[PDB]
Amino acid sequence: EWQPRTPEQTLYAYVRCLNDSSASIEQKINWVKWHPDTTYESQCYVKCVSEELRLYDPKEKRFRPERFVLQAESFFHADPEQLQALKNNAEPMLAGVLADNSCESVFNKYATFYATHHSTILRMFHGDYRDIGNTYAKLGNGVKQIGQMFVDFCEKRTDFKWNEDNSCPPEAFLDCVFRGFRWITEEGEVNVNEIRRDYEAAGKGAADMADYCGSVKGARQLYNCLRDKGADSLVAVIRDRNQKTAFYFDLSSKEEPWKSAVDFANNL
Amino acid sequence: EWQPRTPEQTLYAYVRCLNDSSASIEQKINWVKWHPDTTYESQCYVKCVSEELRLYDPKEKRFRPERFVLQAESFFHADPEQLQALKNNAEPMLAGVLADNSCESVFNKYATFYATHHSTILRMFHGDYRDIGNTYAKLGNGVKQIGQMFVDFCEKRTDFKWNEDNSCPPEAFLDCVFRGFRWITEEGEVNVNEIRRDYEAAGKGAADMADYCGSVGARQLYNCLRDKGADSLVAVIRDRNQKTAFYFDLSSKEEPWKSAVDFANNL
Amino acid sequence: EWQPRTPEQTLYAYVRCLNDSSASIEQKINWVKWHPDTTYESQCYVKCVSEELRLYDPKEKRFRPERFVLQAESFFHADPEQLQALKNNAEPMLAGVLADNSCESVFNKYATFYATHHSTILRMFHGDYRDIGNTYAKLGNGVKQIGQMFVDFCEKRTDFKWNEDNSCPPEAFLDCVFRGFRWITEEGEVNVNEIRRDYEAAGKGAADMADYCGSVKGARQLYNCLRDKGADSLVAVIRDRNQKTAFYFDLSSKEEPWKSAVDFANNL
Ligand SMILES: COC(=O)/C=C(\C)CC/C=C(\C)CC[C@H]1OC1(C)C
Ligand SMILES: COC(=O)/C=C(\C)CC/C=C(\C)CC[C@H]1OC1(C)C
Numbered sequence: 196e197w198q199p200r201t202p203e204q205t206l207y208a209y210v211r212c213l214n215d216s217s218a219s220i221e222q223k224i225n226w227v228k229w230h231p232d233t234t235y236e237s238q239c240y241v242k243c244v245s246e247e248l249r250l251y252d253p254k255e256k257r258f259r260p261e262r263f264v265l266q267a268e269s270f271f272h273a274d275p276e277q278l279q280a281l282k283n284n285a286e287p288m289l290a291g292v293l294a295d296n297s298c299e300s301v302f303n304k305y306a307t308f309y310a311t312h313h314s315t316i317l318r319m320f321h322g323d324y325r326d327i328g329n330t331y332a333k334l335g336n337g338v339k340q341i342g343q344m345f346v347d348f349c350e351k352r353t354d355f356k357w358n359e360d361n362s363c364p365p366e367a368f369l370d371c372v373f374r375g376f377r378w379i380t381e382e383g384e385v386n387v388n389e390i391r392r393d394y395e396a397a398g399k400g401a402a403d404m405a406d407y408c409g410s411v412k413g414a415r416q417l418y419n420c421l422r423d424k425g426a427d428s429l430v431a432v433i434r435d436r437n438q439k440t441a442f443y444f445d446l447s448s449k450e451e452p453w454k455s456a457v458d459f460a461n462n463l
Numbered sequence: 464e465w466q467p468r469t470p471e472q473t474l475y476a477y478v479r480c481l482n483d484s485s486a487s488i489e490q491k492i493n494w495v496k497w498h499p500d501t502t503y504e505s506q507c508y509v510k511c512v513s514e515e516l517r518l519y520d521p522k523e524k525r526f527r528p529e530r531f532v533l534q535a536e537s538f539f540h541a542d543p544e545q546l547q548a549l550k551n552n553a554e555p556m557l558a559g560v561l562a563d564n565s566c567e568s569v570f571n572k573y574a575t576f577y578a579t580h581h582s583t584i585l586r587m588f589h590g591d592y593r594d595i596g597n598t599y600a601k602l603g604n605g606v607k608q609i610g611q612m613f614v615d616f617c618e619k620r621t622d623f624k625w626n627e628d629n630s631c632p633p634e635a636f637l638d639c640v641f642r643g644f645r646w647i648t649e650e651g652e653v654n655v656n657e658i659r660r661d662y663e664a665a666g667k668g669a670a671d672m673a674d675y676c677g678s679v680g681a682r683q684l685y686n687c688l689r690d691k692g693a694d695s696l697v698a699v700i701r702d703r704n705q706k707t708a709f710y711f712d713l714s715s716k717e718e719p720w721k722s723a724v725d726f727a728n729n730l
Numbered sequence: 731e732w733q734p735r736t737p738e739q740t741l742y743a744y745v746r747c748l749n750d751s752s753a754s755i756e757q758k759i760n761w762v763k764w765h766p767d768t769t770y771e772s773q774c775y776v777k778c779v780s781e782e783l784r785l786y787d788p789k790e791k792r793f794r795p796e797r798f799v800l801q802a803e804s805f806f807h808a809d810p811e812q813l814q815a816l817k818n819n820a821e822p823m824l825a826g827v828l829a830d831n832s833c834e835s836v837f838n839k840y841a842t843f844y845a846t847h848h849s850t851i852l853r854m855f856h857g858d859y860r861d862i863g864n865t866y867a868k869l870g871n872g873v874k875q876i877g878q879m880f881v882d883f884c885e886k887r888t889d890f891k892w893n894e895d896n897s898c899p900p901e902a903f904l905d906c907v908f909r910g911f912r913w914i915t916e917e918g919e920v921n922v923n924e925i926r927r928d929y930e931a932a933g934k935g936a937a938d939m940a941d942y943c944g945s946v947k948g949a950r951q952l953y954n955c956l957r958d959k960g961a962d963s964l965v966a967v968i969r970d971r972n973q974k975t976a977f978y979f980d981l982s983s984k985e986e987p988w989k990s991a992v993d994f995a996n997n998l
């Protein structure tokens with residue numbers, strides 16, 4: 196069952212959709228201030244973030260209004276009347292199967308709801324840093340914290356110490372790590388493009404990696420398949436990606452769009 | 464010396480006292496909204512929670528008003544006038560030795576103070592999630608966090624890595640773990656009913672466990688249990704440890720848990 | 731590049747400068763209420779805290795007004811007008827080379843800026859516990875938490891498990907630990923007085939320790955030199971100091987000035 200997005204999940208989606216975009220910096224600054232315009236790159240950013248958070252379902256070609264409701268119930272406590280308004284409006288404003296999954300169709304379908312509940316949506320998806328302390332303390336060690344690496348988070352959650360050794364880790368630990376890396380998707384599928392990307396960035400992208408274990412289509416099975424193509428390489432790749440999971444971006448960066456993003460979120 | 468209750472200590476008391484009660488879900492929903500009525504199960508819930516937090520002392524048969532004062536000085540910063548009202552009312556409203564420790568006697572003694580300072584008591588005992596970030600950050604790694612297991616917390620606190628093997632752990636680590644499990648009480652006594660509970664839940668309950676070391680310090684308790692089967696002891700610790708992460712599921716849609724979260728989120 | 735001071739760095743400076751002072755408890759109580767007076771002991775405390783936070787540079791004999799601005803941009807979100815006022819006043823009020831580094835010279839240079847912006851300064855340097863949750867959440871595991879020991883923090887930050895044995899630890903881990911102990915200063919220099927103090931506090935002071943490795947050039951160089959004077963002794967000192975890094979003072983203490991410090995920071 197779809198759970199309310201944590202700040203780890205929203206930050207992952209915001210940052211990854213930003214870096215996958217070739218849009219201008221001025222456009223990306225508008226996005227981190229929560230007002231994407233109607234240009235194609237902005238429409239595709241909204242579609243990307245919506246899909247990554249599983250708010251838009253491309254198989255059914257539909258927004259999932261009930262997930263916006265569940266997000267508001269968990270994370271919007273600033274205004275009971277605005278909470279009830281979102282509950283009443285979500286289904287009528289977001290209902291309907293779209294003719295296609297184009298960025299234009301998804302953005303246009305979202306537009307009325309987004310305009311009507313702008314400040315509520317911003318807050319419930321962790322856009323306002325006045326809430327950041329309460330949000331991370333309510334979730335505690337149930338969410339990966341800013342600056343915490345995913346392997347450490349998964350080791351604690353499963354009560355398992357991983358020595359980067361010959362031992363065979365428990366399936367619950369592997370599942371936690373691979374889902375944090377998005378090697379296994381939220382739906383449980385193998386994400387071979389992500390695996391290949393991390394192998395290549397670690398310098399382990401070789402021809403005898405073949406399909407990167409896309410054939411396996413279970414966390415144990417993926418781990419066993421990758422380890423059989425080179426155990427030392429697999430440890431190296433996991434370590435390399437792990438370091439990059441601590442800070443999705445630098446909250447103290449003075450480069451754009453990061454500086455504008457933090458300034459906006461800090462002073463609402 | 465009694466220290467102001469952490470959110471770990473209050474959440475432990477609230478949940479354990481709820482799960483010990485046979486009251487109806489409708490009653491428990493009222494309790495997690497801080498609205499105990501006067502039925503017997505409600506009176507016993509209030510007594511249970513007060514005793515677990517060491518606010519009511521059954522050996523002396525009295526509330527400890529100075530402990531409510533200390534809790535307010537630590538965790539109530541929202542209204543200076545309501546803080547001073549509580550400090551001046553606690554002793555006159557709560558002091559006095561009771562004729563017995565019955566649920567009715569404890570609840571009735573608490574009633575005027577609770578009615579007069581309801582919203583202050585709620586907030587200073589971590590009932591208002593508007594404060595949850597400041598409270599857990601001020602305590603830091605000094606308190607077990609939501610979702611953290613007690614063994615991890617105790618390993619960090621004592622700078623000890625436990626390999627769950629044949630090593631004999633340092634006493635400060637054992638004391639920390641046993642007190643987190645409430646195998647050793649706040650007063651330092653062995654809590655045999657909790658040890659037995661955890662052995663049975665792990666499938667390691669046996670007749671050779673005998674008295675579960677009631678005859679027995681944390682080193683003494685550890686040595687006594689390990690002498691009855693070292694592998695069983697590790698299995699029991701590991702099984703209870705998994706249960707110390709989330710005292711209840713804050714995402715649960717079952718009652719009373721769903722009402723507990725919605726109320727505390729939206730004051 | 732100088733980074734905005736974390737609450738770990740401000741608490742370290744506040745506590746160490748207090749315990750270094752022989753001033754009376756009545757004076758120290760005024761200091762923890764952000765009310766230094768003009769006595770020599772108070773002037774010296776302000777200078778000590780300013781140097782420890784790298785806000786005053788004794789080598790160039792000047793305050794660094796731009797570092798106050800950077801601190802305010804990071805940690806003061808309560809009043810745009812007071813933020814802008816601080817930004818405009820920092821350089822005119824604080825810039826200028828002093829004739830000497832005396833307590834009187836540093837305090838007098840700081841005094842007008844402080845009298846003018848004291849409430850904003852308090853807040854941006856972590857003096858108001860209404861902010862404490864948001865601050866530690868936004869920094870996350872990138873800062874040592876209250877109650878956390880420095881070796882643990884440094885193990886997680888570098889993804890290294892230290893077994894306190896024969897192993898040769900990675901340099902990034904050594905640098906993190908030594909800098910947290912202030913054995914290596916923020917400028918990268920060996921702090922021999924701090925090393926000797928911790929050796930003595932652990933009962934490992936001895937004539938063979940000689941200059942306590944003040945001669946060396948690098949965290950690896952300092953570690954190799956200390957280990958060569960006695961490996962077991964070095965582990966014991968690290969373990970002893972590590973215990974003391976969890977709680978810089980007892981936030982539940984009823985002794986002064988600790989009690990008034992907590993009382994003041996809680997009820998602003
Ligand atoms: C570091 O990057 C960001 O902070 C990015 C931000 C704040 C972009 C937020 C995302 C949007 C404005 C896209 C639409 C938003 O309504 C959803 C959650 C689809
Ligand atoms: C998960 O369960 C809860 O949230 C339970 C709650 C909020 C019950 C709180 C306890 C009481 C209303 C009992 C009386 C309370 O005054 C004390 C701290 C004795």
Ligand SMILES: COC(=O)/C=C(\C)CC/C=C(\C)CC[C@H]1OC1(C)C
Pocket residue numbers: 744745748761762763764765766775776779780851855857979991
């Ligand atoms: C535990 O000790 C404290 O709480 C100490 C405090 C609050 C002292 C704060 C420091 C000063 C008043 C010195 C000047 C301050 O302006 C700077 C940051 C130089």
